[PDB]
């Protein structure tokens, strides 16, 4: 989980699915690392890909 440059105030429309320990399938990094940042640490990666 590099998410280091987060939070960012958009992300790009590629399609990059990774799983989150939450069961979401989240669209790219850009989402996941967001989605981290406003979790407050609770947020981690499950694995690549959809969940």
Not at 17 to 42: H, W
């Amino acid at each position: 989980v590099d998410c280091s440059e987060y939070p960012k105030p958009a992300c790009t429309x590629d399609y990059r699915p990774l799983c989150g320990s939450d069961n979401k399938t989240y669209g790219n990094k850009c989402n996941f690392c967001n989605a981290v940042v406003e979790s407050n640490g609770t947020l981690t990666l499950s694995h690549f890909g959809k969940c």
